């Protein structure tokens, strides 16, 4: 059994070289590009000697030992069981690498015709460094779209008018995938398979309400294996198991969903990406109420005593089928309440009288997120995306001013994008959009704060139950124990480079200074904050509009 030969023959050389490069760029993010390509080539040539003869020397070594040794040719404490854990824990979610600049379209198109491999290979390299938890088989799909964009646009007349829209759309699609995937790995490493499996049975039951529980259970167990391998660095094992899972869904389509026909006729990488973004299938007609099998039955505690989690999974499956308008987080709350009740009632002398009114306890839990979305969307339309982000900046920096300024401006801008993405939807699609998107933005705050814990209040909010992560953050309130920071003249002084920056890069500078102003005066009236912001907003365009640009900038020193 040669694991390096098994993965090579299942994935093929092209994906093998790509998946091995990604793993190296995520384990050693600070190592240069050309050094990793030399390691990947040597690895790929070694896999060829093992597909020919599986009994050749070192072919029996595991992928962890092979990749660990090849990496440490440049934390490597002998034993491989712990050496792979040193690499995973030292992954830097903000590795402090230089921000990538995009050259002109003719500079990139010439590099695309010159050497197409190293141009696209360096694309997978630079991305895997910045996003060390990126869904590996999903990054191969983004690479193909990044190649088709240059293949089509560089032969077009106006190459810039063609390439820039497709590259800007790909950039935003990638940042969202990385955020969604980082959440999947946090729920596994910090909460276990049970937490992730429950998430999977809820999201898939809404997506596949036609499928039976055994069909959903098989998909969930296989999908958990894929993401457990992908989050633990087993990228070759991850992309192999994902392809086999996509083959099963397509060879058993009528047992899963009806919106899988056009997905199962695309190429391999498109096939898996198509199923991950498929619309929720229609609910089967005439579904009985859950009270018959979960409350009004005399065999509720009998079936629950055999396998509690399997019974709880059936309850979550049956409840998630009938409510595609509920968020996954809400569906986990209704399933945990039904669990707490069964634990109390199945030990009593009359469990039927005890859990007869458990479904009434779900009614208050449903209306809590419905009030969160309706109130904030009504304020989003009145403010606009840019004013909604600024109002969230001053509000949340008063709740927790210990969090660093780049983190506060980061998660506040992403909450404005939740209003731009979900508030347009009706009240039906508002809850699974907003509450689940709100889950991945808070996960950014948690992870970015986990690197340097400054506020113990946020840490307790992240370390507790992730299902209760949104309600714990609502009840923070202003932190009066924090003392205002002394005024720094360099944080308010601007540079002449503010002209060359884009409007989005220039408005981030202004949202940064807003956070530094509230950290200097936490007890600042909402009227006095807009007066200081609008005053510097005038000096940003007025001083740049003059011939002596940087000269008038210094004149505003007081
Ligand atoms: C649907 C959108 C308009 C969205 C906008 C923000 C709003 C919200 O208030 N979120 C906070 C999260 C938080 C807590 C503390 C610090 C930083 C963020 C919470 O209350 O959980 C929820 C809906």
Curated annotation (Swiss-Prot):
Q: Which residues bind Zn(2+)?
A: 64, 232, 234
Q: What is the effect of changing residue 555 to K?
A: In Osaka-2/Phnom Phen/albumin B/Verona
UniProt keyword annotations, A-Z: Calcium, Cleavage on pair of basic residues, Copper, Disease variant, Disulfide bond, Glycation, Glycoprotein, Lipid-binding, Metal-binding, Methylation, Phosphoprotein, Repeat, Secreted, Signal, Zinc
Tissue specificity field: Plasma.
What's one GO-annotated cellular component?
Answer: nucleus
Tell me what effect the entry lists for residue 339 to K.
Answer: In Hiroshima-1
Superkingdom of the organism of origin: Eukaryota
Q: Which SMART domains match?
A: ALBUMIN (SM00103)
| Family according to the record | Belongs to the ALB/AFP/VDB family.
Q: Which disease is it linked to?
A: Hyperthyroxinemia, familial dysalbuminemic: A disorder characterized by abnormally elevated levels of total serum thyroxine (T4) in euthyroid patients. It is due to abnormal serum albumin that binds T4 with enhanced affinity.
What is the designated name of this protein?
Answer: Albumin
The opening ranks of the lineage are: Eukaryota, Metazoa, Chordata, Craniata, Vertebrata
Gene name linked to the record: ALB
